[PDB]
Amino acid sequence: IQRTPKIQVYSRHPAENGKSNFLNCYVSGFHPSDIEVDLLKNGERIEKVEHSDLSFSKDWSFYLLYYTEFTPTEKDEYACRVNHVTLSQPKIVKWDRDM
Amino acid sequence: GPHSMRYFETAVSRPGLEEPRYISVGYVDNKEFVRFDSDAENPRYEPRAPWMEQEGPEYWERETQKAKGQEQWFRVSLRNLLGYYNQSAGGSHTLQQMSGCDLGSDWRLLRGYLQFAYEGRDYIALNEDLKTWTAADMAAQITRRKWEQSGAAEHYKAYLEGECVEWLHRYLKNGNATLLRTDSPKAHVTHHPRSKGEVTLRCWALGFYPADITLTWQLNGEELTQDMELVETRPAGDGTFQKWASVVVPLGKEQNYTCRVYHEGLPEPLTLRWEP
Amino acid sequence: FAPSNYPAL
Ligand SMILES: *[C@@H]1O[C@H](CO)[C@@H](O)[C@H](O)[C@H]1NC(C)=O
C-alpha cells in the first residue's frame, strides 16, 4: 500500500515575536516509512533539526515529529518540506501562526 | 479510565542487505517507554521513559534478547510473505505487529491484542477470544492454518493474559507520577473569512494529556456535522497535545455558534464562542 | 515486557 503523508506545521506554544518557541512539523499517515522532511526558514533548509523516532498508529501508517527551537519574528516565514514516494514532487506547507 | 501496554514492531526488508531493519517500540497508556533499533551501533532496548531507569541489567538483557529473537522471526516471515505473494527480490517490504493488553480502571484485563500487517495492510490478527484468527486475505489463509495446526494462539493468549498484564501493572506502579496525570485543554476560537458571506471559526485545544479529546461545534443547541473539519490530534512536543475543529459560518451570525471541549481532565466541558 | 513470536508467518 502507499499512503500519502499528512503534514502539519505549527509552533509548540502560541507564537510570540521575540519569545523563544519550538517549530514543529508533524508528518503522519504515511506508508511505506521512507520519508524525507525538512524545516525551512525563509525558504532555506534548517541544519539543526531533530525529530522523534519512527512510529506508527492503529491503521499501520507511520508518523514522525520534526522540530527545532526558534524565535518567531514578524517577517521570518517558516515552512516544512516533505518528499515521499506518494508525492510526484516535494510538498511544501507554510507555517501559519494565526491559524 | 482504562490502561494498556503495546509493542509496535516493524521490519523493513531492503535490497542487497540480507538483514532487514527492525524497530520495536513499547508503550504504556500510549506513552513510549522502551525502544529497540537494529541499526543502532549497539542494538538493545533503551529506556524511553524516566521510570524505566530503575530496571537493572538483567531486565534489559532479557528484553534485548527477545528483540534479537524477533528480528529473525521477522526476517523469516518477510521471506515467506515474499513467496506467498509471488513477489520478486531486489525490493523493499514492510511487516508490522501490534501486541498488548487493555486494562480497565480496575487494572483488570479487558482485551488481548495481537495482529500483523504486510505492506501496510492487515494480514492476520488474533481474534478477541484469543483462541482463533482472522486472515485478511488468501495468503493469510495459509498462515491461519499453519497456526491453527501449531496452536500458536495458546502461547500468545498466555502472554497477553499473564505476563502482559503483570508487567503492565508494574509499569503503572513505577510511572505513577507521570503516567496517571491529566492536563486539561486550554481553548480559544479563531476567525477567518472563507468565501462571500462565509466565515471559518476554529475551536482550538492546547496543552492537554491524555490525547483523547472531543471537540464539537453547535448552532443553538444542535450539533453540527456538515462543513465541519476536525484536524488530526498532534503532539505539541512537551508531552501534551493539540487539536482543533473548524466550521463554516454565514458572515455576521457568528456568535450563534458555540463549541465544547471534552476531556477527562475537565470537571465540566469548556464552552466558548468567537469573542471579537 | 515484550512478547516473543512462535511460528513464522
Ligand atoms: C519467544 O519466541 C521465540 C522465537 O521467536 C521462541 O523460541 C520462545 O519459545 C518464545 N518464548 C517463550 C517463553 O516461549
In angstroms, the CA B92 to CA B118 distance is 11
C8 lines ligand 1 (CB under 6 A): no
Instruction: Give C6→chain B minimum CA distance, Å.
Output: 6
Q: How far is the CA of B69 from the centre of ligand 1 (A)?
A: 8
Query: How far, CA to CA in Å, does B216 sit from each of A55, B206, B236, B269, C3?
Result: 29, 15, 21, 11, 39
**Residue from C4, C5, C6 to probe the interface with B (highest B Cβ count within 10 Å):** C5
Q: Do B96 and A56 touch (CB under 8 A)?
A: yes
Q: Is the preceding omega at residue B267 within 30 degrees of 0, hence cis? A: no
Q: Do B8 and A56 touch (CB under 8 A)?
A: yes
The answer to whether B97 contacts chain C (CB < 8 Å) is yes
Give helix then strand counts, H and E, for chain C. Answer: 0, 0
In angstroms, the CA B53 to CA B15 distance is 37
Provide the resolution (angstroms): 2.7
Query: How far, CA to CA in Å, does B231 sit from each of B112, B214, B246, B267?
Result: 30, 12, 8, 24
Residue A5 has what DSSP assignment? P
Walk me through the domains of chain B, giving residue ranges and CATH numbers.
Answer: 1-181 (3.30.500.10), 182-272 (2.60.40.10)
Residue A47 has what DSSP assignment? S
Q: Which residue of B has its CA nearest to C1?
A: B167
Between strands B198-208 and A21-30, the pairing is unpaired
User: If contacts are CB pairs under 8 Å, which of residues 164-193 in chain B contact chain C?
Assistant: 164, 166-167
B159 lines ligand 1 (CB under 6 A): no
Residue A96 has what DSSP assignment? -
- Helix pair angle (B152-161, B163-174), 10° resolution: 30
Give helix then strand counts, H and E, for chain B. Answer: 5, 17
Walk me through the domains of chain A, giving residue ranges and CATH numbers.
Answer: 1-99 (2.60.40.10)
Atom of ligand 1 nearest to the CA of B66: 1
What would you measure as the largest C-alpha separation in chain A, in angstroms? 44
Buried b (16+ CB within 10 A) or exposed e, A1-15: eebebbbbbbbbbeb
User: If contacts are CB pairs under 8 Å, which of residues 24-63 in chain A contact chain B?
Assistant: 24, 26, 28-29, 31-34, 52-56, 58, 60-61
How long a stretch of residues is chain A?
99
Which residues of chain B does C4 touch, with a Cβ-Cβ cutoff of 8 Å? 66, 69-70, 159
Residue B254 has what DSSP assignment? -
What single string gives the DSSP state of each residue in B10-64?
EEE--SS-SS-EEEEEEEETTEEEEEEETTSSS---EE-SGGGTT--HHHHHHHH
CA-closest residue to ligand 1 atom 6: C6
Q: Tell me, yes or no, whether chains C and A touch by having 3 or more C-beta pairs under 8 A.
A: no
Q: Do A65 and B35 touch (CB under 8 A)?
A: no
Q: Is the preceding omega at residue B210 within 30 degrees of 0, hence cis? A: yes
Q: Which of C1, C4, C5 is the pocket-test mutation for ligand 1 (most atoms within 8 Å of CB)?
A: C4
Q: Is the Cβ–Cβ distance between B100 and B113 less than 8 Å?
A: yes
Provide the grid cell at B8.
Answer: 509496535
Q: Do C7 and B67 touch (CB under 8 A)?
A: no
In angstroms, the CA A83 to CA A40 distance is 14
CA-closest residue to ligand 1 atom 7: C6
Q: How far apart are the first and last CA of chain B?
A: 37
Residue A31 has what DSSP assignment? B
Of B218, B201, B228, B198, residue with least CA distance to B262: B218
For chain C, state the CA radius of gyration. Answer: 8
- Chain A / chain B CB contacts < 8 angstroms: 62
Q: Do C3 and B73 touch (CB under 8 A)?
A: no
What residues have CB less than 8 Å from A62, skipping those under 6 apart?
A28, A29, A30, A31, A32, A33, A35, A54, A55, A56
A40 HSE (CA, 13 A, CB side): 15
Q: Do A3 and B120 touch (CB under 8 A)?
A: yes
Provide the grid cell at A27.
Answer: 508528518
Which residues of chain C does B33 touch, with a Cβ-Cβ cutoff of 8 Å? none
> What phi and psi, each to the nearest 5 degrees, are found at residue A4?
-65, 140
In angstroms, the CA A8 to CA B40 distance is 29
Q: Is the Cβ–Cβ distance between B150 and B124 less than 8 Å?
A: no
Q: Give the number of other Cβ atoms within 10 Å of residue B263's Cβ.
A: 23
